[PDB]
Structure formats: structure tokens, C-alpha cells
Design a protein around this motif. Structure first.
Motif, PDB file in Angstrom:
ATOM      1  N   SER A  62      49.751  39.730  69.527  1.00 44.49           N
ATOM      2  CA  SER A  62      48.867  39.115  70.520  1.00 44.49           C
ATOM      3  C   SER A  62      48.386  40.165  71.500  1.00 44.49           C
ATOM      4  O   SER A  62      49.128  41.062  71.837  1.00 44.49           O
ATOM      5  N   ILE A  63      47.135  40.023  71.943  1.00 48.26           N
ATOM      6  CA  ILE A  63      46.477  40.951  72.853  1.00 48.26           C
ATOM      7  C   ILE A  63      45.848  40.125  73.984  1.00 48.26           C
ATOM      8  O   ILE A  63      45.162  39.132  73.728  1.00 48.26           O
ATOM      9  N   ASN A  67      43.108  42.204  83.564  1.00 49.48           N
ATOM     10  CA  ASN A  67      41.971  42.018  84.457  1.00 49.48           C
ATOM     11  C   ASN A  67      40.739  41.542  83.669  1.00 49.48           C
ATOM     12  O   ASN A  67      40.649  41.755  82.463  1.00 49.48           O
ATOM     13  N   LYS A  68      39.795  40.921  84.362  1.00 42.82           N
ATOM     14  CA  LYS A  68      38.697  40.206  83.722  1.00 42.82           C
ATOM     15  C   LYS A  68      37.924  41.039  82.683  1.00 42.82           C
ATOM     16  O   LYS A  68      37.475  42.171  82.956  1.00 42.82           O
ATOM     17  N   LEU A  69      37.810  40.468  81.482  1.00 44.79           N
ATOM     18  CA  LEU A  69      37.009  41.040  80.406  1.00 44.79           C
ATOM     19  C   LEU A  69      36.039  39.963  79.904  1.00 44.79           C
ATOM     20  O   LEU A  69      36.461  38.876  79.474  1.00 44.79           O
ATOM     21  N   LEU A  70      34.751  40.259  79.964  1.00 47.00           N
ATOM     22  CA  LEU A  70      33.738  39.325  79.482  1.00 47.00           C
ATOM     23  C   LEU A  70      33.366  39.593  78.018  1.00 47.00           C
ATOM     24  O   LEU A  70      32.805  40.647  77.691  1.00 47.00           O
ATOM     25  N   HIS A  71      33.659  38.628  77.148  1.00 48.92           N
ATOM     26  CA  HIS A  71      33.394  38.780  75.727  1.00 48.92           C
ATOM     27  C   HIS A  71      33.506  37.411  75.047  1.00 48.92           C
ATOM     28  O   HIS A  71      34.382  36.618  75.398  1.00 48.92           O
ATOM     29  N   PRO A  72      32.609  37.114  74.082  1.00 44.73           N
ATOM     30  CA  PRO A  72      32.646  35.817  73.370  1.00 44.73           C
ATOM     31  C   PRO A  72      34.023  35.474  72.767  1.00 44.73           C
ATOM     32  O   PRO A  72      34.419  34.311  72.768  1.00 44.73           O
ATOM     33  N   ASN A  73      34.735  36.492  72.266  1.00 44.25           N
ATOM     34  CA  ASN A  73      36.007  36.310  71.543  1.00 44.25           C
ATOM     35  C   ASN A  73      37.239  36.487  72.418  1.00 44.25           C
ATOM     36  O   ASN A  73      38.365  36.544  71.919  1.00 44.25           O
ATOM     37  N   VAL A  74      37.026  36.618  73.720  1.00 44.03           N
ATOM     38  CA  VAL A  74      38.131  36.713  74.672  1.00 44.03           C
ATOM     39  C   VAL A  74      38.125  35.497  75.634  1.00 44.03           C
ATOM     40  O   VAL A  74      37.103  35.187  76.267  1.00 44.03           O
ATOM     41  N   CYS A  82      41.012  36.226  70.733  1.00 41.62           N
ATOM     42  CA  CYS A  82      41.060  35.262  69.640  1.00 41.62           C
ATOM     43  C   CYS A  82      41.923  35.736  68.464  1.00 41.62           C
ATOM     44  O   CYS A  82      41.679  36.781  67.871  1.00 41.62           O
ATOM     45  N   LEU A  83      42.926  34.930  68.146  1.00 39.19           N
ATOM     46  CA  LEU A  83      43.882  35.196  67.087  1.00 39.19           C
ATOM     47  C   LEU A  83      43.206  35.298  65.710  1.00 39.19           C
ATOM     48  O   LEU A  83      43.601  36.125  64.869  1.00 39.19           O
ATOM     49  N   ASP A  84      42.188  34.470  65.480  1.00 44.20           N
ATOM     50  CA  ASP A  84      41.455  34.504  64.216  1.00 44.20           C
ATOM     51  C   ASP A  84      40.728  35.824  64.016  1.00 44.20           C
ATOM     52  O   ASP A  84      40.755  36.390  62.918  1.00 44.20           O
ATOM     53  N   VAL A  85      40.069  36.322  65.059  1.00 48.35           N
ATOM     54  CA  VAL A  85      39.377  37.590  64.892  1.00 48.35           C
ATOM     55  C   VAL A  85      40.327  38.783  64.752  1.00 48.35           C
ATOM     56  O   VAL A  85      40.066  39.669  63.944  1.00 48.35           O
ATOM     57  N   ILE A  86      41.448  38.769  65.479  1.00 45.14           N
ATOM     58  CA  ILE A  86      42.518  39.741  65.227  1.00 45.14           C
ATOM     59  C   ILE A  86      42.956  39.715  63.744  1.00 45.14           C
ATOM     60  O   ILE A  86      43.001  40.764  63.085  1.00 45.14           O
ATOM     61  N   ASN A  87      43.238  38.510  63.230  1.00 42.45           N
ATOM     62  CA  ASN A  87      43.699  38.309  61.833  1.00 42.45           C
ATOM     63  C   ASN A  87      42.712  38.676  60.725  1.00 42.45           C
ATOM     64  O   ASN A  87      43.123  38.916  59.590  1.00 42.45           O
ATOM     65  N   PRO A 111      30.407  41.855  69.153  1.00 43.36           N
ATOM     66  CA  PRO A 111      31.053  40.563  69.354  1.00 43.36           C
ATOM     67  C   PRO A 111      30.768  39.564  68.249  1.00 43.36           C
ATOM     68  O   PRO A 111      29.806  39.717  67.492  1.00 43.36           O
ATOM     69  N   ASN A 112      31.588  38.526  68.170  1.00 39.80           N
ATOM     70  CA  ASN A 112      31.276  37.400  67.294  1.00 39.80           C
ATOM     71  C   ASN A 112      31.086  36.046  68.022  1.00 39.80           C
ATOM     72  O   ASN A 112      32.054  35.281  68.186  1.00 39.80           O
ATOM     73  N   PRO A 113      29.823  35.737  68.428  1.00 41.19           N
ATOM     74  CA  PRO A 113      29.456  34.436  68.998  1.00 41.19           C
ATOM     75  C   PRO A 113      29.652  33.243  68.037  1.00 41.19           C
ATOM     76  O   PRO A 113      29.290  32.112  68.390  1.00 41.19           O
ATOM     77  N   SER A 114      30.194  33.498  66.836  1.00 44.65           N
ATOM     78  CA  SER A 114      30.731  32.433  65.967  1.00 44.65           C
ATOM     79  C   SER A 114      32.145  31.995  66.423  1.00 44.65           C
ATOM     80  O   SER A 114      33.045  32.837  66.606  1.00 44.65           O
ATOM     81  N   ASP A 115      32.326  30.676  66.592  1.00 44.82           N
ATOM     82  CA  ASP A 115      33.561  30.082  67.159  1.00 44.82           C
ATOM     83  C   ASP A 115      34.116  30.855  68.385  1.00 44.82           C
ATOM     84  O   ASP A 115      35.243  31.346  68.355  1.00 44.82           O
ATOM     85  N   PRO A 116      33.321  30.937  69.475  1.00 39.50           N
ATOM     86  CA  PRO A 116      33.713  31.741  70.632  1.00 39.50           C
ATOM     87  C   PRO A 116      34.785  31.088  71.505  1.00 39.50           C
ATOM     88  O   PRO A 116      34.867  29.862  71.601  1.00 39.50           O
ATOM     89  N   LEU A 117      35.608  31.924  72.125  1.00 37.26           N
ATOM     90  CA  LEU A 117      36.604  31.482  73.070  1.00 37.26           C
ATOM     91  C   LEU A 117      35.926  31.420  74.434  1.00 37.26           C
ATOM     92  O   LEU A 117      36.328  30.663  75.335  1.00 37.26           O
ATOM     93  N   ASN A 118      34.904  32.253  74.582  1.00 36.64           N
ATOM     94  CA  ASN A 118      34.027  32.184  75.715  1.00 36.64           C
ATOM     95  C   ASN A 118      32.611  31.836  75.245  1.00 36.64           C
ATOM     96  O   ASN A 118      31.852  32.732  74.838  1.00 36.64           O
ATOM     97  N   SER A 119      32.257  30.541  75.279  1.00 33.73           N
ATOM     98  CA  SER A 119      30.929  30.109  74.775  1.00 33.73           C
ATOM     99  C   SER A 119      29.761  30.419  75.689  1.00 33.73           C
ATOM    100  O   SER A 119      28.630  30.558  75.214  1.00 33.73           O
TER     101      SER A 119
END
Length: 150
Positions: A62-63, A67-74, A82-87, A111-119
Motif C-alpha cells: 500500500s502507498i 501531504n496533499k497529492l492531486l491525481h485521478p488515481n489518488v 488506488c490498489l487496482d492501479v498498483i496491481n 494518470p488513469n481517469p478510468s475508475d478514478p478515486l478522485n473524480s
């Protein structure tokens, strides 16, 4: 006698990483990460919370950005990646150092705007990549400056 659970963090120390174990656990540590050059993350510094699960290396680490990181998958609130993108990248043969040297810089660059953790970030990026990256750059100045962790 030595597992990857026990010893892998040493490879980050060897690679030149600044890291700190949490409560003397070899499976729980915070590592300093610098934003990739030529990206909107350039000049940013983050503290990254890594934990290694008990079935590591068959399960991935896990990662979590501390401090604040702006990203679709975070996840914006927790900083959790996102565990799926790590995997999609992690295999039992993948290197812990490469998580920081290869996986994360890649991910932050593309980035992957597919199934985002940050939409919201996914939407903004879909609408206008340049406007999006102007946001990231300001977020980086604000929430990931040099002095933040000292």
C-alpha cells in the motif's frame, strides 16, 4: 533467514532514499519522494506511507501520500493510491525501489481517469489537460513545498 518483508526497505536506503521505519516495523515506513521532472509535479516533495502486507511480495504494497497529492488515481482526503492501479504493475518479481523510481513517476505523468478515486481531478483532466496541470502546479506549490517536512 531473511525475507523480502524483512529486508526490502534496505534497497530504498541503498538507492539513496530518506526513509523512517514506523515503530521498528520493516513493513511500515515513510519515505521521501520528489516530484518527477518536466511534470506538473516538478519541485514537489511528498512523504509517502508504505506498508508491506503479510503476503508480500505476492500481495503488493500500500502507498499513501501524506501531504496533499492531486491525481485521478489518488484518494484526495487520505492520499491513498488506488490498489487496482498498483496491481496492474505489481508482480511478485517487481522491485520495491521501482515503485518509487518507475511506477509512481509514470503514474503521475500519465494518470488513469478510468475508475478514478478522485473524480473531480479525472473530470478536470478530461475537460482540459492544460487547465488541469495549472491546478496541479499550484497544489504542488501549496501542499508540497521544500520546507513542509523540514
Amino acid at each position: 533467514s531473511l525475507t523480502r518483508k524483512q529486508c526490502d526497505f534496505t534497497k530504498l536506503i541503498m538507492a539513496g532514499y530518506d526513509l523512517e521505519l514506523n515503530n521498528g516495523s520493516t513493513q511500515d515506513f515513510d519515505v521521501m519522494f520528489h516530484g518527477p521532472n518536466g511534470t506538473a509535479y516538478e519541485g514537489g516533495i511528498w512523504k509517502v506511507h508504505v506498508t508491506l502486507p503479510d503476503d508480500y511480495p505476492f500481495a503488493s504494497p500500500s502507498i499513501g501520500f501524506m501531504n496533499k497529492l492531486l491525481h485521478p488515481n489518488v484518494d484526495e482526503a487520505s492520499g491513498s493510491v488506488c490498489l487496482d492501479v498498483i496491481n496492474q504493475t505489481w508482480t511478485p518479481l517487481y522491485s520495491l525501489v521501482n515503485v518509487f523510481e518507475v511506477f509512481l513517476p509514470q503514474l503521475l505523468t500519465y494518470p488513469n481517469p478510468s475508475d478514478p478515486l478522485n473524480s473531480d481531478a479525472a473530470s478536470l483532466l478530461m475537460k482540459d489537460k492544460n487547465i488541469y496541470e495549472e491546478k496541479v502546479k499550484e497544489y504542488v506549490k501549496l501542499y508540497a513545498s521544500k520546507d513542509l517536512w523540514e
